[PDB]
Amino acid sequence: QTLLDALNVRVVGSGERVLVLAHGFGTDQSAWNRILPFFLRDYRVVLYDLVCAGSVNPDFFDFRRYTTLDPYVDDLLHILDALGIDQCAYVGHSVSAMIGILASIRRPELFSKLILIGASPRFLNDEDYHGGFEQGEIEKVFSAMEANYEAWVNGFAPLAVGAAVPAAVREFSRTLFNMRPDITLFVSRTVFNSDMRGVLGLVKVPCHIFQTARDHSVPASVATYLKNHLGGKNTVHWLNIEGHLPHLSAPTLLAQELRRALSH
Secondary structure: OHHHHHOOOEEEOOOOOEEEEEOOOOOOHHHHOOOHHHOOOOOEEEEEOOOOOOOOOHHHOOOOOOOOOHHHHHHHHHHHHHOOOOOEEEEEEOHHHHHHHHHHHHOOOOEEEEEEEOOOOOOEOEOOEOOOEOHHHHHHHHHHHHHOHHHHHHHHHHHHHOOOOHHHHHHHHHHHHHOOHHHHHHHHHHHHHOOOHHHHHHOOOOEEEEEEEOOOOOOHHHHHHHHHHOOOOEEEEEEEEEOOOHHHHOHHHHHHHHHHHHHO
């Protein structure tokens, strides 16, 4: 119950099939605000904030604990258990896509379906795998973020939103500015160090892979990689939406594709 309060757990909607909406890097659950109206009539919608969200008390971000994705999975499973949820459909953006994959491996019975948005198991390039980023290039950026957080947010947000949707750039910048800069840097390192490729085969639940055009953080080839390597039944949705944050930039269109996927 203190966990439910700490992470701003919210349950809304008139339906009884459970839909979990799990935000990713640099936002909080408010990123789903424009999606949500499309699901209240026929779902029970569960929202929460990751511990690193700007909307969470930064006292709760224990650097000794949150060193990999596993402790974030602990939080997600604690919440679903505390709400008495024995089965749900789960939508995860960005890092929450990977948290849901790990959660499903721990609790295969808990998820009927995963919907992954802007998901990558690995950002760094190697000889056989294109993640979109070179190891050599990332330290100069981490240094830049530490030196001048505001300059980093101002350069990052437009590239993340991608499409010419100035309101979404301003909104993503707002939630990045709510995050404590040392938490943002630590979480950024955690996600660049992640390598989920080893475990994709262990997933048995069906996965819908939502891939935007010109996602600065997810090459097209990564969505195909997930389709080939996730252990269950996979469907790729090539969204007619540009940028990494379609729930912020194109909510009406994203909501229709989510409804389609949840009906499948």
